[PDB]
């Protein structure tokens with residue numbers, strides 16, 4: 001009941017802050033809808049709880065919680081069980097509401113995303129659209145190239161994503177260099193299909 | 203009512219600290235006057251509240267709260283809506299009392315400022331004074347040049363400013379290089395009018 | 405009684421988190437067994453308590469708490485009392501349950517370990533096993549070489565270890581360069597006995 | 607009364623921690639004697655309180671609290687009022703008990719000290735002793751040279767010092783390069799009187 005009580009306290013604090021800034025009741029509604037989807041009436045201090053454990057127990061728990069997600073991801077079917085673990089322990093859960101732009105083309109990228117549930121549209125400057133759904137990943141090209149985002153990515157439904165920051169990305173890939181080659185190969189093919197080629201991926 | 207209660211608790215804690223250090227009742231008055239203007243009886247944990255949201259919702263809220271400020275700023279009238287967003291999310295509100303020196307000439311600079319409400323005087327070593335008011339910015343030349351502050355800046359009224367740190371400055375400007383050129387052009391003209399030229403701005 | 409009360413509060417919070425994630429009662433049992441061995445019904449905020457002290461008092465306390473551990477370690481019998489102090493203040497206590505792999509061969513290493521109580525097995529890719537017990541250390545070769553772990557290390561009993569991170573390691577060894585030579589000599593001999601030679605240790 | 611209550615709570619927490627580690631009643635006495643001299647029955651959260659203020663108010667308060675200390679220090683009599691301010695805002699108060707070694711010869715140095723109240727002995731390897739008292743500073747040579755401590759420094763009475771870390775030191779001295787020359791000159795003379803010369807001070 002501490003987890004529920006903490007949800008209630010933090011939400012009330014948001015309500016107060018929204019009241020103070022005189023936000024539209026319709027936008028407050030949007031915030032509430034976000035809290036409901038993202039937290040579902042509960043807040044745990046995950047990092048604090050896992051911080052009390054040792055390494056193996058931390059990795060056991062996360063592997064356990066992320067079983068359905070891992071089953072769904074081609075990246076991981078075939079991959080080393082320990083690469084899968086090194087990624088999982090670095091993931092941040094995030095939720096987006098339909099219509100929200102997750103990534104805008106042309107900006108500097110600082111994270112990658114894995115789709116657990118939802119549909120996203122990858123939109124090029126030139127108006128071509130490709131859909132990505134459960135088990136796919138996007139946002140990695142910028143991280144490989146140290147360049148800019150090559151396309152926009154817009155939630156077409158509620159999306160439940162896990163993000164991975166550029167430092168955690170580069171770290172896991174120092175440890176698993178074969179997996180860098182796997183990401184670059186897909187990146188090259190994805191770029192080709194949108195009229196692009198970057199030779200730093202070769 | 204948590205926001206008010208937190209103001210009261212933190213103020214009382216300051217009172218205690220001032221009592222302990224036996225500060226003059228007139229200087230305590232000055233502190234109280236500062237708390238009143240800066241907080242207006244409320245303390246929110248903004249960073250904690252916004253930390254619970256996703257990116258788009260964070261940016262929506264800030265864009266919303268900063269509408270009057272943005273309207274007032276020539277820097278932003280004409281500028282990309284997304285450059286404006288990248289700056290806004292990095293701003294720290296600060297208040298100064300009349301007579302306070304915000305910037306002293308000759309020192310190393312670590313932040314820039316945007317005026318929301320108030321009058322400042324830009325004072326040269328040679329005694330020339332230029333006034334800056336709502337919608338203007340100062341403190342940027344040092345950040346561009348990696349040199350020292352080229353003039354002093356003194357609050358002539360209560361000022362309500364937003365500051366931007368040198369790291370956030372350089373970060374936004376990596377992402378929007380055209381805006382670096384816009385800052386340098388104004389910087390060159392401002393320097394010329396005070397007898398200065400620095401070739402690292404060309 | 406604050407220390408006990410804090411154990412109870414934090415454990416209850418873990419229970420809640422495990423209930424939420426619907427973890428097997430047998431794995432929850434494993435977690436509880438871990439809490440019991442690691443904390444023994446108490447949680448102190450060590451870093452906060454020691455943070456209030458000065459340097460000498462901090463070092464006195466730690467030297468005192470770690471007397472049995474220091475007696476048991478050949479590394480330290482003969483070593484400078486001040487090298488021993490510089491290491492001790494940087495140690496993190498950790499507990500492992502029988503069967504847990506502390507180190508997997510082939511991965512990047514970020515810490516070293518000192519055994520206070522327990523038996524570990526050092527396992528090579530080629531299936532050779534060497535046991536290490538109270539007073540020994542493992543996990544240092546990777547830190548010296550900036551390479552990868554040269555063997556796996558598996559707890560064969562409950563182990564009570566103290567870890568030392570790669571930054572604290574390199575820091576103490578900048579201050580005591582003779583002790584780097586002592587670690588490298590043992591490292592060279594340990595590698596030789598497992599079919600390995602790395603010339604960056606010479 | 608929050609400040610007193612916080613002293614009581616934190617002390618009780620130390621008592622508990624000492625009871626747990628079965629520390630000698632005589633060493634517990636030493637800890638209590640330290641708390642009494644260092645805190646005098648009160649704990650303020652200084653950094654949190656000053657964090658709520660603007661720059662000028664922060665600097666006013668510290669200048670005010672440190673008036674007796676500043677009067678006593680030759681380094682500062684004559685120095686720019688703004689160099690004095692830049693140092694003061696970076697100082698950490700610390701207390702040492704008679705007999706404690708503040709600095710051991712031969713180690714890497716990470717801070718400097720200013721004496722507010724007390725007597726210290728500067729002891730060379732060769733057994734020569736020089737006393738330093740209110741208004742003096744020690745611990746700076748290592749910071750200038752990036753070398754090792756050139757002498758030991760032992761509290762001969764209770765000492766009330768303010769420390770300045772190597773980063774804050776180098777930072778203030780980037781901003782006031784004339785003051786680096788002032789420190790180096792005294793450093794050269796101090797070294798000469800103990801049989802030493804380091805050419806990186808020229």
Ligand SMILES: Nc1ncnc2c1ncn2[C@@H]1O[C@@H]2COP(=O)(O)O[C@H]2[C@H]1O
Pocket residue numbers: 103109122130132137138139140141142143148149150151152153189190191193194
């Ligand atoms: N042809 C494609 N098919 C699917 N996804 C793509 C394609 N091209 C780009 N993307 C994604 O759009 C993302 C936009 O950000 P990034 O460039 O970092 O990474 C990009 C890809 O992950």
Ligand SMILES: Nc1ncnc2c1ncn2[C@@H]1O[C@@H]2COP(=O)(O)O[C@H]2[C@H]1O
Pocket residue numbers: 305311324332334339340341342343344345350351352353354355391392393395396
């Ligand atoms: N001619 C000018 N007109 C208006 N403002 C100025 C002028 N010259 C300098 N300033 C401001 O004074 C500031 C002092 O700090 P900075 O050099 O960092 O940046 C400087 C400018 O932003």
Ligand SMILES: Nc1ncnc2c1ncn2[C@@H]1O[C@@H]2COP(=O)(O)O[C@H]2[C@H]1O
Pocket residue numbers: 507513526534536541542543544545546547552553554555556557593594595597598
């Ligand atoms: N021959 C050996 N005898 C005992 N321990 C060893 C031997 N070889 C390797 N180890 C330990 O196994 C550890 C695995 O990680 P590291 O390479 O970092 O350091 C290694 C050693 O500390």
Ligand SMILES: Nc1ncnc2c1ncn2[C@@H]1O[C@@H]2COP(=O)(O)O[C@H]2[C@H]1O
Pocket residue numbers: 709715728736738743744745746747748749754755756757758759795796797799800
């Ligand atoms: N001749 C001297 N007189 C007074 N103090 C000294 C003398 N020589 C060294 N010290 C102090 O002893 C300190 C030991 O640490 P540091 O070398 O960092 O700096 C040294 C000086 O500040």
